[PDB]
Design a protein around this nucleic acid. Sequence first.
DNA 1: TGACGCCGGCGTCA
DNA 2: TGACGCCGGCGTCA
Lengths: 67, 67, 68, 68
Amino acid sequence: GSHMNTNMVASELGVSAKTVQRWVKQLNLPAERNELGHYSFTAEDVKVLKSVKKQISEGTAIQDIHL
Amino acid sequence: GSHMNTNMVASELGVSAKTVQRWVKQLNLPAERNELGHYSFTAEDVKVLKSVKKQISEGTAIQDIHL
Amino acid sequence: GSHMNTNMVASELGVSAKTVQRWVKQLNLPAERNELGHYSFTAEDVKVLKSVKKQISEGTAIQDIHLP
Amino acid sequence: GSHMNTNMVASELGVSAKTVQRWVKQLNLPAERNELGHYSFTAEDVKVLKSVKKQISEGTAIQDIHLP
DNA sequence: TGACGCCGGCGTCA
DNA sequence: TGACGCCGGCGTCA
């Protein structure tokens, strides 16, 4: 559907829900916040997190990530 | 200073956190929602709540209370 | 009132009922339970609970907290 | 080499890593632990857990979770 | 980072 | 409605 939840996004990136949480928080990434505080990432947001993954897999430190 | 939390609003109204959550959920009182999903009421959002309290104590059914 | 409900004890400790109930179980404070299953705290029990909160905020580990 | 970590098992079951760790503590399920304390589920572990997910949905109580 | 326990909202029994 | 457990976000420790 439109968006997925942290769990779905983490299983697809092969990372942990915790990691997803740290990335969004630390990187100030824009995602929709659910009425209960749950992260809601759209197909477009994933593209962002997908990038964060690739960049990280190149020695790039999370603080030094460009978006 | 300008935003009360459920635990606070409840202690004042002399009720449980669950009671407050139940009045907000059932009667749809638009109250500022926290980025985490926590209710955050205004000094005046407290009145509307202290109102329902007095009404209820007068035999007023929740589904019947008016805002 | 020889007893106070979880919500009274909580409003005095500036915490939710959840937090109070959590502490109770974690340290096993024989605390009474009325015929309805609700918790009935005695002004004596509130004393112990207030203590815990103090020690807790002082870094004292759940497992380390002292009680009578 | 079939040793999955909490994250991989949670993905296969379609639940959070937290939900998994509970099912484990709650039912004393056998899960190996690293020097670091990280879980490492085998082929069986994932099956037992996958079965629990079933019963849980079928309304079966925790304390009553058949355990092949 | 993983494990873990706290926190506040929510559905559910009683 | 209180007690209880689950949820997912978040802080903290190792």
